[PDB]
Amino acid sequence: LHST
Amino acid sequence: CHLSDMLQQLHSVNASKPSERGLVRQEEAEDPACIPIFWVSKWVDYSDKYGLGYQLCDNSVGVLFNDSTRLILYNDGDSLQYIERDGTESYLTVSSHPNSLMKKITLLKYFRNYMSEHLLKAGANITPREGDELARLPYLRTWFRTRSAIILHLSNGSVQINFFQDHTKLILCPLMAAVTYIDEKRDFRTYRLSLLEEYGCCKELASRLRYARTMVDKLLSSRSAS
């Protein structure tokens, strides 16, 4: 649901 | 637009079968003059309710809302650009905006706050380039996700592909006709696609360029708009  | 060029460039390199030659000389294909100006450094998928928020490498922020409108906050922290569905652009600031954009600006703030405190900047090891910070920023034209990756298409023609599992990333530019590959160690190499044809590349990059072509095809087959 989101980047690293 | 430029997607057609990108598809040409990818087909051409894939057709050369760059990983199936005697001696791969991938390093000869690197071209530092082609390093991209902009890429997505962070993103937040809140699309079940509001939209896709992202941070560009210049610390600017943007949101592509579920109603196909967009807000771009420049890295000065106040200057705002609103893009309507049809692409109409208007300029304003967080401090001075129509009341009609209250909700969307509040959402932008939350996205901004979150990506300011959380998450690693992709491409952090690539030089911040001295430029006109207010020069027109690209915005997120469209995006989608597969099981394996998130695909991000910018209004400057660039296509970014982030792979979920191994965290590798491609930044494709049809203007430079180049691809930047970020590998598992976060090493950042930019290649001219025509030189990958000439000198070849490892099977890992070759596989990702094949996937990239498929993704560009999806973008082209669903470009829609009104």
From Swiss-Prot, chain B:
Q: Which residues carry this modification: Phosphothreonine?
A: 127
Phosphoserine-modified residues are 4, 79
Region Linker, annotated ranges: 122-136
Spell out the disulfide connections. Answer: none
Query: Cross-link of type Glycyl lysine isopeptide (Lys-Gly) (interchain with G-Cter in ubiquitin): positions?
Result: 121
Q: What induces it?
A: By growth-stimulating agents.
Positions of the region Important for interaction with phosphorylated proteins?
167-169
Q: Where in the cell is it found?
A: Nucleus; Chromosome, Centromere, Kinetochore; Cytoplasm, Cytoskeleton, Microtubule organizing center, Centrosome; Cytoplasm, Cytoskeleton, Spindle
Q: Where is the POLO box domain?
A: 39-117, 139-221
Q: Changing residue 169 to M: what effect?
A: In pincer mutant; loss of centrosomal location and decreased interaction with phosphorylated CDC25C and BUB1
Tissue-level expression: Placenta and colon.
Q: How is it modified after translation?
A: Ubiquitinated by the anaphase promoting complex/cyclosome (APC/C) in anaphase and following DNA damage, leading to its degradation by the proteasome. Ubiquitination is mediated via its interaction with FZR1/CDH1. Ubiquitination and subsequent degradation prevents entry into mitosis and is essential to maintain an efficient G2 DNA damage checkpoint.
Task: Give the linked disease.
Answer: Defects in PLK1 are associated with some cancers, such as gastric, thyroid or B-cell lymphomas. Expression is cancer increased in tumor tissues with a poor prognosis, suggesting a role in malignant transformations and carcinogenesis.
Q: State what this protein does.
A: Serine/threonine-protein kinase that performs several important functions throughout M phase of the cell cycle, including the regulation of centrosome maturation and spindle assembly, the removal of cohesins from chromosome arms, the inactivation of anaphase-promoting complex/cyclosome (APC/C) inhibitors, and the regulation of mitotic exit and cytokinesis. Polo-like kinase proteins act by binding and phosphorylating proteins that are already phosphorylated on a specific motif recognized by the POLO box domains.
What family is this protein classified in? Belongs to the protein kinase superfamily. Ser/Thr protein kinase family. CDC5/Polo subfamily.
What's the domain remark here?
A: The POLO box domains act as phosphopeptide-binding module that recognizes and binds serine-[phosphothreonine/phosphoserine]-(proline/X) motifs. PLK1 recognizes and binds docking proteins that are already phosphorylated on these motifs, and then phosphorylates them. PLK1 can also create its own docking sites by mediating phosphorylation of serine-[phosphothreonine/phosphoserine]-(proline/X) motifs subsequently recognized by the POLO box domains.
**Subunit and partners:** Interacts with CEP170. Interacts with EVI5. Interacts with FAM29A. Interacts with SLX4/BTBD12. Interacts with TTDN1. Interacts (via POLO-box domain) with the phosphorylated form of BUB1, CDC25C and CENPU. Interacts with KIF2A. Interacts with CYLD. Part of an astrin (SPAG5)-kinastrin (SKAP) complex containing KNSTRN, SPAG5, PLK1, DYNLL1 and SGO2. Interacts with BIRC6/bruce. Interacts with CDK1-phosphorylated FRY; this interaction occurs in mitotic cells, but not in interphase cells. FRY interaction facilitates AURKA-mediated PLK1 phosphorylation.
Protein's name in the database? Serine/threonine-protein kinase PLK1
Native source species: Homo sapiens (Human)
User: Which gene underlies this protein?
Assistant: PLK1
The part of the entire sequence present here spans 372 to 597 of 603
